[PDB]
Amino acid sequence: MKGYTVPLSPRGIANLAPAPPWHYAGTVVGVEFFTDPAAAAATLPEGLTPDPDSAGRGVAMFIDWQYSSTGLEYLDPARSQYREFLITLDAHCNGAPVAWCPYIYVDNDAAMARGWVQGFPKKLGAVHQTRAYSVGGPGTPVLGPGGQFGATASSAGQRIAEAKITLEQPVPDPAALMSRPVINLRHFPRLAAGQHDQPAVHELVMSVLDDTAVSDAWVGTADLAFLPAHGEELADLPVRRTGKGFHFDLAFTVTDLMTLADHS
Amino acid sequence: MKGYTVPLSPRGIANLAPAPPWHYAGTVVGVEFFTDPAAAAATLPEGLTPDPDSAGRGVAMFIDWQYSSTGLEYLDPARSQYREFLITLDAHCNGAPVAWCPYIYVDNDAAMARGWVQGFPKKLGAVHQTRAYSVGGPGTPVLGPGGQFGATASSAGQRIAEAKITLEQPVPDPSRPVINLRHFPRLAAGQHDQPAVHELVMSVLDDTAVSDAWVGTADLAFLPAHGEELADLPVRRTGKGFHFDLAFTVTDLMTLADHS
Amino acid sequence: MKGYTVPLSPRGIANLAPAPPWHYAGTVVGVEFFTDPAAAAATLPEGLTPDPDSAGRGVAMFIDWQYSSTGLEYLDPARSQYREFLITLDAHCNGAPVAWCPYIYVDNDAAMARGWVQGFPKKLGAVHQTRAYSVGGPGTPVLGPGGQFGATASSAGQRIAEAKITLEQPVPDPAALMSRPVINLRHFPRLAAGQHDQPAVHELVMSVLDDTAVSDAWVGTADLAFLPAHGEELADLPVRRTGKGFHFDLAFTVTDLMTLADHS
Amino acid sequence: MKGYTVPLSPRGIANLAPAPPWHYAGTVVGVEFFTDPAAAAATLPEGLTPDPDSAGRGVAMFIDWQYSSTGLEYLDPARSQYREFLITLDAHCNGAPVAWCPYIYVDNDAAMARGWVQGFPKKLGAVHQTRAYSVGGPGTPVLGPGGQFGATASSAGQRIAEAKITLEQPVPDPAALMSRPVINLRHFPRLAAGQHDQPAVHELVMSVLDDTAVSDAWVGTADLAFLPAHGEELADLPVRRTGKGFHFDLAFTVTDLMTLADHS
Ligand SMILES: *[C@H](/C=C/C=C/c1ccc([N+](=O)[O-])cc1)C(=O)O
Ligand SMILES: *[C@H](/C=C/C=C/c1ccc([N+](=O)[O-])cc1)C(=O)O
Ligand SMILES: *[C@H](/C=C/C=C/c1ccc([N+](=O)[O-])cc1)C(=O)O
Ligand SMILES: *[C@H](/C=C/C=C/c1ccc([N+](=O)[O-])cc1)C(=O)O
Ligand SMILES: [K+]
Ligand SMILES: [K+]
Ligand SMILES: [K+]
Ligand SMILES: [K+]
Structure with a gap:
């Protein structure tokens, strides 16, 4: 049998996701927010410490993704396109600023499988963001000063996040938006009796992104609520205040992953 | 009892669609195709006749739409964004070349209702098209020569159309009006063959705009x-594939013939 | 061209719904509720009167439907099965007790089309109800005393109703559950400029059900909230108090519809 | 952090699936089928061998499931109800008759996660089966002689299986329907560079079902096609012949899993 994820199969096609490389191109509606430092700290795994400078800060991202591998998989958008909502929380790993991801939602099963392999704790959800069309007109915002973008996320038919941003000016340093590495947790439990508290996989990991690119980056104001x-x-992290709003394209390739600590 | 479509309500909010204006911005992946003239003619309503020059020609379009009205409804993409697959067939209306729409599928109930009001015979379906991202890279095609785009449409969990285009050249000067049939039947016993609304209409589009248009080769199959x-209009051969952005506003509709 | 609803077609197959008869078999989780009389009155169309005895009373129903016509269409459950949430409000039509339906949600486009033809103002939604399995065990309630059933409805990814009932005893008079006729409003607007307020169809109708049958009818307690x-x-009809909860099978055929008043 | 599956969380609620026990109650439309022995053998993992008596025989099952745990989770059908399509293939393990599951589809993310933990290689799909209603009438088949039931499964908007059965008589020995134990493969890959062919979890497992019960079991004729x-x-297992069709309720509890061979 062949394949990278299940199902393994004679031809290695049925698997939810093939082996890397995994290529990504997406458009992000992002909102900087601030919650209670203690609430953020409660979600951190062992190995991460509260950020001494920005404890309580986080980023909420709504992304329209397109995925591909080595065979122009993006020509099959029914499988390759998916929409994603995640939050990251500022934290430290041994004195270095990092972005811990406690929650993330996608509308695609292949994306969910790829996420689990990466340690993204993906669940299914419905995610939407306003889109900018270059033709213009009253059906689209302008991707520029004054343009307004909405975004929402639901899970199991329940709305969990609603956001809006208003763009003001270009981002001076676009590459800096990806300065904090994302930290995740690969986790796969055991089902054998007596072992339900002894997961087979349980390891803190750092996301490794190849050939990362950011373009068309804009910044402005933002409104955000968790429900x-x-x-x-998610709503146990109350939005006490919103920071800046962001809009940008993002692209990278996934071929690797760094294990920080293997807790068995 | 305020509102435009059902449900009517005390505040006029719950209705599936409010009154026009309806604004649209979309990206189109389309394929010119040719089917059997007799098959195309079989779909034509009373009032339309076969095209004496291009009978059998049609256009298949997959569109990623964003809708809005007078209140920045596009800030609510859960309701305002939808994806659409339709075909049109060349025909004549009183000697004038037109494009008849027999079938169309959308993934949004508000779009379905707006379509019924326009005479678009919308059903629900799952529609997807490859997207081009300006950041570039191996996760996206590049709009331009050699850029490839796939598109598919399903209905009730069944795949009904699969397409791919390869762009070759830009179109510098980016033509048939769309003809539809407003149709609403009666349920009173004895009148199931006497629809309450049954009228040929011509789509009216305000402030139409097309941008970044490309043409190239195409593959298309109806399943x-x-x-x-749909598959009763088999693709005997394909013409040009095309890719462009499209915008217009809907405020009006032209009744051609009332068959009620 | 052939067909009943759109799309009309050469074979009359593609249409969302064929001509009647339309057959229905369903399982209902229902909750009697009481809202503000003034709120219920605000939803009533011209022609209906507030109920002089039970103004403000309504019924919320979550139904798992199976539809069929003349050709064993129920063998195609991908098209024929659907789930439905509606409310009715007590009202009077010329001194006679009736049930006005202002809002209803389904998860199936064919059912939406059939509803519009009947005057049910159907929109898309996600509807679920606990199911009772004859095999029994910890995965199912008992269809009998003590059995608990939950039900929910969402629209556009937003939860709009959550309900729970606990069965106590058989319904004393099952037939009486369908005593109030349902009143609906067939409505189809015009798009021609200048006529957006002059609908082409606008007529109050009474639902006509053939061969109505009820079975396995139980009554008990209920909890309900609109969100x-x-x-x-919907939430503008707040649940001030809940009445009885109901669980029963329902079946009927649709071949007819009574026009009460044509207004446009 | 609390939880059984991801996401782990402060309160242990956000996780896709909590720790067992997992309770199941379902209604099965089943079809015995026969494919090419070599095609079935091509799907078998190491440790399983062709069945020396019935190589090529399989069972296609369409199931309407309701799940619960220790807190009446079946009162939340939006999360707890799901529909499932799977096939099993006759095989042998060390001379014992077993049932290997190569492919399985569900319409619920929690079910997919529970399956992965069990080694069921679940992907997302749309699954439907005709339902029998006690009220009777033209909208439902009879759960008895002559009753016809249809069932379908799609994946990514593509139909992969269509089936129909016609019931004839009760199953003589209902408990015998669950005679072959199901064999699965727990599998969780690595993403670290150089280890994409060295999965972290890769073990043959035998399904353990507690308190298995069958009721209302019927048998008859069947038609089946993989597309x-x-x-x-799936269609690489062509249906050369269909055997009997089955309709029955099924219930069991999952608390355990038997690891047969660790191939990691
Ligand atoms: C699942 C998800 C892939 C991860 C996407 C992602 C989001 C945000 C950042 N970030 O650093 O802000 C990085 C990666 C999949 O389908 O792979
Ligand atoms: C429903 C759809 C209305 C607009 C669709 C449409 C498609 C194609 C053309 N065309 O000119 O090729 C025009 C309009 C709705 O949601 O309104
Ligand atoms: C759309 C809806 C059919 C109507 C169902 C219904 C609900 C409730 C009552 N009632 O008297 O309480 C009657 C009928 C369709 O798919 O036809
Ligand atoms: C995922 C699936 C659970 C397994 C279901 C199942 C199907 C068939 C048999 N069988 O013995 O034929 C046994 C179990 C989940 O949501 O747990
Ligand atoms: K604009
Ligand atoms: K590229
Ligand atoms: K029980
Ligand atoms: K029957």
Whole structure:
């Protein structure tokens, strides 16, 4: 049998995701927000410490992704396109600023599988963001000063996040938006009786992104709210204040992943 | 009892679609195709006749739409964004070349309702098209020569159309009006064959704009499916593939013939 | 061209719904509720009167439907099965008790089309109800005393209703559950400039059901809440108090519809 | 951090699936089928061998599931109800008859996660089956002689299986329907460079079902077809002949899993 993820199969096609490289091109609506430092700290895994300078700061990102591998998979958009909502929280790893990801939602099963392999704790959700069309007109915002963009995320039919940004000026240092590495947790439990508290995989990891590119980056103001929902804990990170709003394209390739600590 | 479409309500908010103006901005992946003239003619309503020059020609379009009205509704993409697959067939209306729309599919209930009001016979479906990102890289095609775009449409979990285009040249000067049929039946016993609304209409588009248009080669197939008839217009050969942005506003509709 | 609803076609197959008869078999989770009489009155169309005895009373129903016509269409569950959430409000039509339906949600486009033809103002939604399995065990409630059933409805990814019932005893008079006729409003607007306020169809109608049958009818206690949501007005009929909860099978055939008053 | 599957969280609620017990109640439309012995053998993992008596035989199952755990989770059908399509293939393990599961599809993210933990190689799909209603009438088949039931499965908008059964008589020995234990493969790859062919988890497992129960079991005739689809390999198991069709309720609890061989 062949394949990278399940299902393994005779021809290695049925698997949810093939082996890397995984290529990504996306458009991001992002919102800087600030929650209670203690609430953010409660989500951190062992190995990460509160950020001494910006504890409580986080970033909420709504992304329209397009994925591809080595065979022009982006020509099959029914499988390759997906929409994603995640938050990261400022933290430190041994004195270095990092971005811990506690929650993330996608509308695609292949994306969910790729995320689990990376340690992104992906669940299914419905994610939407306003789109900018270059033809212009009253059906689209301008990708420039004054342009307004909305974004929402739902899980199991429940709205969990709603955001709006208003662009003001270009980002001076676009590459700096990706300065903090994302930290994740690869986790796969055991089902054998007596071992439900002894996961087979449980390791802190740092996301490794090849050939990262950011373009058409804009910054402005933002409004954001997290909403309580049954079976979710996002709203346990209350939005006390919103920072800047961001809009940019993002691209990278995934071929690697750094294990920081293997907790068995 | 305020509102434009149902549900009517005390505040006029719950309705699937409010009154026009309806604004649209979209990106189109399309394929010119040719089917059997007799098959195309079989779909034509009363009032339309076969095209004496291009009978059998049609256009398949996959569109990523964004809608808005008078209140920045595009800030609510969960309701305002939708994806659409339709075909048009060359025909004549009183000697004038037109484009008849027999089938169209969308993934949004508000778009379905707006379409019914326009005479677009919209059903629900799953529609996807490759997207071009300006950042570039291996996760996206590049708009321009050699850029490849795929598109698909499904209905009730059944794939009904698959397409791919390869762009070759830009179009410097970016023509048939779309003809639709407003149709709303009666349920009163004895009147199931006497629709309350049954009228040929011409789509009216305000402030139409097309940008960044490209043409190239194309592959297209319609697939047989239960409860669908699209594949009864088999693709005997393809013409040009094309890619462009499209914008217009809807405020009006032209009644051509009332068959009720 | 052939067909009943659009699209009309050479074979009359592609249409969203064929001509009647339309057959229905369903399982209902229902909740009697009481809202503000003035709020219920605000939703009533011209021609209906507030109920002089039970103004403000309504019924919320979550239904798992199976539809069929003359050709065993229920063998195609991808098209024929759908789930439905609606409310009715007590009202009077010329001194006779009736049930006005202001809002209804389904997860199926064919059902939406059939609804519009009937005057049910259907929109898309996600509807779910707990199901009872004869095999029993910890994965199912019992269809009998003590059985608990939950139900929810969402629209555009927003939760608009959450309900729970606990069964106590059989319904004393099952047939009486369908005593109030449902009143609807067939409505189809015009798009020609200058006529956006002059609908082509605008007529009050009474639902006509053939061969109505109820079975396995139970009654008990109930909890219900409507939730505010963007683009919805259901929560403007707040649940001030809940009445009885109901669980029953329902079946009927649709071949007819009674026009009460034509207004445009 | 609390939780069984990802996401781990402060309160242990956001996780896709909590720790077992997992309770299941479902209604199965099943079809016995026969494919090419060599095609079935091509899907078998190491440790399984062709069945010396019935190589090529399989069972296609369409199931309407309801899940619960220790807190009446079936009162939240938006999360707890899901629909499932799978096939099993007759095989042998060390001379014992077993049922290997190469492919399986569900319409719920929690179900997909639970399956991965069990070694069920679940992907997202759309699955439907005709339902029998006690009220009867033209909208439902009879759960008895002559009752006809349809079932379908799609993946990424592509139909991959269509089936129909006609019931004839009760199953003589209902408990015998679950005689072959199911064999699965727990599999979780590595993303670290150089280790994309060295999965972290890769083990043959046998499904352990507690308190298995079958009821309302019927048998009859069947028709079945697998359809080719991009990104799938189900149709590489062509249906040369269909055997009997089955309709029954099924219930069990999952608390355990038996590791047969660790191939990591
Ligand atoms: C699943 C998700 C891939 C991860 C996407 C992602 C989001 C945000 C950052 N970031 O650094 O802000 C990085 C990666 C998949 O389908 O791979
Ligand atoms: C429903 C759809 C209305 C607009 C669709 C459309 C498609 C193609 C052309 N065309 O000129 O080729 C024009 C209009 C809605 O949501 O309004
Ligand atoms: C659309 C809806 C059909 C109507 C269902 C219905 C609900 C409730 C009652 N009632 O008397 O309480 C009657 C009928 C369709 O798909 O037809
Ligand atoms: C995922 C799936 C659970 C497994 C279901 C299943 C199907 C068939 C048999 N069988 O023995 O034929 C056993 C179990 C989940 O959501 O757990
Ligand atoms: K604009
Ligand atoms: K490229
Ligand atoms: K029970
Ligand atoms: K029957």
